[PDB]
Structure 1
Amino acid sequence: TVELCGRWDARDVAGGRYRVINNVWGAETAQCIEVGLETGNFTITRADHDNGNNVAAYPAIYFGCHWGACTSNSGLPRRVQELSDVRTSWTLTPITTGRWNAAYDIWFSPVTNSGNGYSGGAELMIWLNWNGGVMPGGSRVATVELAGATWEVWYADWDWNYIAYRRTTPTTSVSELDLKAFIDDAVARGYIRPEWYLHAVETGFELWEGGAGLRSADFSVTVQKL
């Protein structure tokens, strides 16, 4: 294993299929993650965050293109209308302290270049677990049954459409979760356009306060085209 403490530190894992990023984007407080190079499994070993109501960091593992940095042979970006199946697996180990969430962050945009972000596109989040009273951005517009569970739907109209699906009850693991079901729901609500491209599927922990001890494991993503 290797411990990454740099603000923008990263490591390609699983033969380059995925990439793990320390990603301390919203604060200057210290954070380190210990990463297993073959699997991408990681534990947050240090997190001095105390950022109030703002997110301090999002240590994560991803598949695809994150702000122009792409993983190897992901097959992304690809148009939503051209996807037939999108699946993912993940196992998280929660802690009982701090203010954080365990959530997927999926990016979409009208264009193929993601180097300058995803303005005019959409950010689709799937919250699986959390602690400390943290809540999604925007407001709750619905509660729907999808992919075997019940989810609160939160929406916010920012530079891009923010859509967050929050499980009604927390969980610690998903195996071959049907991501297309969430994409289809978002499309039906007019939050995502079929012509837009899916750029990246990421998962990790948004940290507001603390976070040491959280573990990410068994990450996998598969995409099948029509």
Structure 2
Amino acid sequence: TVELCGRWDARDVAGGRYRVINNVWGAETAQCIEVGLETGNFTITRADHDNGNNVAAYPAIYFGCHWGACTSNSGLPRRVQELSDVRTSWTLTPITTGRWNAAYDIWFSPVTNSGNGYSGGAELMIWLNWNGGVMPGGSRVATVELAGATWEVWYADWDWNYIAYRRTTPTTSVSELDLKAFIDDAVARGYIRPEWYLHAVETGFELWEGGAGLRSADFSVTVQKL
């Protein structure tokens, strides 16, 4: 394993299929993650965050293209209308202190270049676990049954459309979760357009305060085109 403490530190893992990023994008407080290079599994070993109501960091593992940095042979970006199946697995280890969530962050945009971000596109989050009273951005607009569970749907109209599906009860693992079910729901609500591109599928922990001890493991993403 290797411990990464740099603000924008990263490592390609699993033969280049995925990439792990320390990603302390919202603060200057220290954070380190210890990463297994073959699997991408990681534990947050240090997290000095105490950021109030703003997210301090999002250590994560991803498949696809994150702000122009793409993993090896992901097949992304690809238009939503050209996707037939999108599945993912993940196992998280929660802690009982701090303010954080365990959530997928999935990015879409109308164009193929993601170097300047996803303005005019959408951010689709799937919250599986959390602690400390944190809540998604925007407002709760519905509660829906999807992919075997029930989820609150939160929406915010920002620079990009923010959509967060928050499980009604927390969980610590998913196996071959049908991400297309969530994409289809967001398309039906008008939050994502079929002509937009899916750029990246990421999962990790948004941290507001603390976070040391959280562990990410068993990550996998597969995408099948029509």
TM-score normalised to the size of structure 2? 1.00
Distance of 1:136 and 1:150 partners within structure 2: 16
Distance of 1:158 and 1:5 partners within structure 2: 31
1:41-60 equivalences in 2 (<5 Å): 41-60=41-60
Q: Deviations over 1:170-196 (max 9, x none)?
A: 000000000000000000000000000
Unaligned residue ranges in structure 1 (runs of 5+): none
Unaligned residue ranges in structure 2 (runs of 5+): none
Distance of 1:161 and 1:52 partners within structure 2: 24
Q: Deviations over 1:23-64 (max 9, x none)?
A: 000000000000000000000000000000000000000000
Q: Deviations over 1:139-158 (max 9, x none)?
A: 00000000000000000000
Distance of 1:203 and 1:32 partners within structure 2: 17
Distance of 1:212 and 1:55 partners within structure 2: 15
SS in 2 for 1:32: strand
SS in 1 for 2:182: helix
Paired positions, count: 226
Aligned to 1:183: 183
SS in 2 for 1:186: helix
Distance of 2:17 and 2:2 partners within structure 1: 18
Distance of 2:123 and 2:76 partners within structure 1: 16
Deviation of 1:210 after TM superposition, in Å, equals 0.1
Deviation of 1:160 after TM superposition, in Å, equals 0.2
Deviation of 1:126 after TM superposition, in Å, equals 0.1
Distance of 1:27 and 1:107 partners within structure 2: 22
Distance of 1:206 and 1:14 partners within structure 2: 23
SS in 1 for 2:206: strand
Distance of 1:54 and 1:193 partners within structure 2: 29
1:153-192 equivalences in 2 (<5 Å): 153-192=153-192
Distance of 1:97 and 1:114 partners within structure 2: 35
Aligned to 1:65: 65
Q: Deviations over 1:70-128 (max 9, x none)?
A: 00000000000000000000000000000000000000000000000000000000000
Distance of 1:156 and 1:8 partners within structure 2: 27
Aligned to 1:29: 29
Distance of 2:53 and 2:68 partners within structure 1: 28
Check if 1:82 corresponds to 2:92. no
Deviation of 1:212 after TM superposition, in Å, equals 0.1
Distance of 1:97 and 1:208 partners within structure 2: 11
Distance of 1:85 and 1:9 partners within structure 2: 31
Deviation of 1:217 after TM superposition, in Å, equals 0.0
Superposed CA RMSD in Å reads 0.1
Deviation of 1:67 after TM superposition, in Å, equals 0.1
SS in 2 for 1:162: strand
